[PDB]
Design a protein around this ligand. Structure first.
Ligand SMILES: Cc1nc2ccc3ccc(CNc4ccc5c(c4)CN([C@@H](CCC(=O)O)C(=O)O)C5=O)cc3c2c(=O)[nH]1
Ligand SMILES: Cc1nc2ccc3ccc(CNc4ccc5c(c4)CN([C@@H](CCC(=O)O)C(=O)O)C5=O)cc3c2c(=O)[nH]1
Ligand SMILES: O=c1ccn([C@H]2C[C@H](O)[C@@H](COP(=O)(O)O)O2)c(=O)[nH]1
Ligand SMILES: O=c1ccn([C@H]2C[C@H](O)[C@@H](COP(=O)(O)O)O2)c(=O)[nH]1
Lengths: 264, 264
């Protein structure tokens, strides 16, 4: 994608060499924002092949409030396995914060159903936020959240979303993080009889790891193909009721996949 | 300043007319970012006179964990007055979350001590964040956090900071919020022997209120002037014991302070 290839070119031309907790070394910039008008096409990378199945299953997993990896295993998703303890638990991560943020006095707030009730009764609110950054439970999480915070806004009967991502692995994580959030914006728009607006991505530490530089220069020498189409074949009774097979992706024809190591 | 003024015209050319909680009406955009190189001077507006004594007093009030406007009265800062209960209290707002985010298990977390220790021991960290968006406590706050989430970054001996401001009053609040955080970046750079870097601002619902258009049109015809320079006259034993006496701006030659109606 134009926006994606241009962030890669910007971290290569402006990135400073940093060290990081996984030992691997990075090229790094701080502060970046880009926008995708979701009516132009579904924002899934065409310069290397990505796999929808995985983006969808992790999204369904977040929406049920799940933080154990067995659901993901049942549907062949492996990326969470190094962080999981012996019982497959990742601790209070995304799915838990989304659906059941713990308050000081006993309570639990479901941030997803709150947001659906704000878009319905009060779409002009400036407080239609979902946060995963629970400072209090961060010591209990397998990984502190990268895509930590997001805000929805409604305009001419169109739903927009902005995500604050504190840390971003440009080459490996970001194809999946933007497809994940753009999918949640078609799901919340369908539920609210709203049209799709913009998905705005903002990054804190936006980086390329040192052992991704050949890969990066190969992908960037590929010109983008036309952006694919998302078809939802079913409007479920609630947002928690989407199954994998409601979603069809049309017109997706990518360049060959490019592999690269995950820094631990 | 040119970034701030470019944003102001953008909200007029492109802003959607929205109804808001006050009734006043607004012109609005979603998703906007601004980079301020702090080497080039202090980012306090020159097109209208801003009063540094109130900026510096609100911020020392935050850093001490205080949610009662008593301190701000001793030192004449008003603005938090319609939101305070008869005992002068705002609920667990900014300062309470910066210094004492409360767990489910009784304990508290001092996010400013955490963040100073991370800057003094692990500067490459992509988790040097402090959040004021405490979901389990939003209902006990008089007004939910506008400047909600920020992240620090260390690259070539320089300290940078990025802010997420969910809802923004371009005319009134935004001049004060840019100086306030740029100021914090200077106190943190000083306590941690780092040079100052970039201050990056990211907004959600960025808006201009209807009854501000005249003052905005007056401001857009005035040219910006050179930025001031912030001298910090001493080096305190901790970031918690700074004082009004310690801050000085050389080179501030603004246009007159412009009066404009606040919305309740
Ligand atoms: C350094 C780093 N660490 C991470 C650790 C946790 C993550 C969890 C999820 C995601 C983003 N979500 C997905 C969700 C599914 C897949 C992938 C990523 C990557 N992908 C693997 C497939 C793994 C496999 O062989 O089965 C791939 O590289 O193609 C997936 O199918 C990124 C990370 C990162 C990440 O991208 N970078
Ligand atoms: C509509 C609106 N509501 C707010 C809610 C309370 C706020 C609290 C803090 C700040 C930002 N902090 C400061 C810090 C200093 C000053 C002001 C605000 C406003 N101001 C007034 C004086 C104080 C007053 O309005 O009572 C001025 O003359 O410009 C100050 O000197 C803005 C708001 C807004 C805000 O920006 N706009
Ligand atoms: O959704 C995800 C999850 C993780 N990461 C990356 C960010 C960093 O490269 C790494 C997490 O390491 P820290 O930032 O916590 O150090 O994983 C992503 O890009 N996207
Ligand atoms: O630091 C601050 C505090 C408040 N506001 C503004 C944001 C909105 O204009 C209004 C708060 O209204 P809500 O967003 O909460 O609805 O005050 C600022 O811009 N900066």
């Amino acid at each position: 994608m134009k926006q994606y290839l241009e962030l890669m070119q910007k971290v290569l031309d402006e990135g400073t060499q940093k060290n990081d907790r996984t030992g691997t070394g990075t090229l790094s910039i701080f502060g970046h924002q880009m926008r995708f008008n979701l009516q132009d096409g579904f924002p899934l990378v065409t310069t290397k092949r990505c796999h929808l199945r995985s983006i969808i299953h992790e999204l369904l997993w977040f929406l049920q409030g799940d933080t154990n990896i067995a659901y993901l295993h049942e549907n062949n998703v492996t990326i969470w396995d190094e962080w999981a303890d012996e019982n497959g638990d990742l601790g209070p991560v995304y799915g838990k914060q989304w659906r059941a943020w713990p308050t000081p006095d006993g309570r639990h707030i479901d941030q997803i159903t709150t947001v659906l009730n704000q878009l319905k009764n009060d779409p002009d609110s400036r407080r239609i936020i979902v946060s995963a950054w629970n400072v209090g439970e961060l010591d209990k999480m397998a990984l502190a959240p990268c895509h930590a915070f997001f805000q929805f806004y409604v305009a001419d009967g169109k739903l927009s979303c902005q995500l604050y991502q504190r840390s971003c692995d440009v080459f490996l994580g970001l194809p999946f993080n933007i497809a994940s959030y753009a999918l949640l914006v078609h799901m919340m728009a369908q539920q609210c009889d709203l049209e799709v607006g913009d998905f705005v991505w903002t990054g804190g530490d936006t980086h390329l790891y040192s052992n991704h530089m050949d890969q990066t220069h190969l992908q960037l020498s590929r010109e983008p193909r036309p952006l694919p189409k998302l078809i939802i074949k079913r409007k479920p009774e609630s947002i928690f009721d989407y199954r994998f097979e409601d979603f069809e992706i049309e017109g997706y024809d990518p360049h060959p996949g490019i592999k690269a190591p995950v820094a631990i």
